[PDB]
């Protein structure tokens, strides 16, 4: 017998949460913030001070070697310490940003593209999608606006960002 059979005891005691390759864990995610408290963010503002680094990627990229530069809204802690203290936890900055894509989104969409949409390959009309965790907008899992997307990406975004 090459695996022994389960116990209804081990079904009932089996732990399954949902799991994701493309999102920081939970326990990674615990970890961004603990540090992040640590280092002198109030924790009130954890969201909304991640979210400073969320939109330097939007325009930036979110790549490993990224050149994270300039300050966040907290002194003696810059964008670029933000960056260490989520690498820190074990999860990339990409994954970081995937899971705040959707607040990013509504916060940039229609009102101020990623900067330099045009230099990476863009149509005017695909705009809104040229940063590199849009893949994370419609990811339900990922951290959601408090009244939902202000709008759908269109299938031309979704098709822009897919074939980069």
Do not use: H
């Not at 390759?21 to 939970?26: D, E, G, R, V, W």
């Not at 924790?43 to 790549?63: I, K, P, Q």
């Not at 916060?107 to 149509?123: F, I, Q, V």
């Amino acid at each position: 017998i090459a695996f022994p059979a389960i116990t209804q005891e081990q079904m009932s005691s089996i732990k399954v949460d949902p799991t994701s390759n493309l999102l920081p864990s939970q326990e990674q995610l615990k970890s961004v913030s603990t540090l992040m408290v640590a280092a002198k963010v109030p924790a009130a503002s954890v969201t909304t001070v991640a979210l400073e680094l969320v939109n330097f990627c939007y325009d930036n990229g979110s790549s490993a070697y990224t050149t994270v530069t300039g300050p966040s809204s907290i002194p003696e802690i810059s964008l670029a310490q933000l960056a260490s203290i989520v690498k820190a936890s074990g999860t990339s900055l990409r994954k970081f940003c995937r899971y705040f894509a959707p607040i990013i989104w509504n916060l940039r969409t229609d009102k101020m593209a990623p900067a330099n949409w045009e230099a990476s390959g863009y149509k005017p009309s695909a705009k809104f999608a040229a940063f590199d965790f849009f893949d994370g907008v419609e990811n339900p899992a990922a951290m959601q606006p408090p009244s939902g997307l202000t709008r759908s990406p269109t299938q031309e975004e979704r098709i822009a960002n897919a074939t980069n």
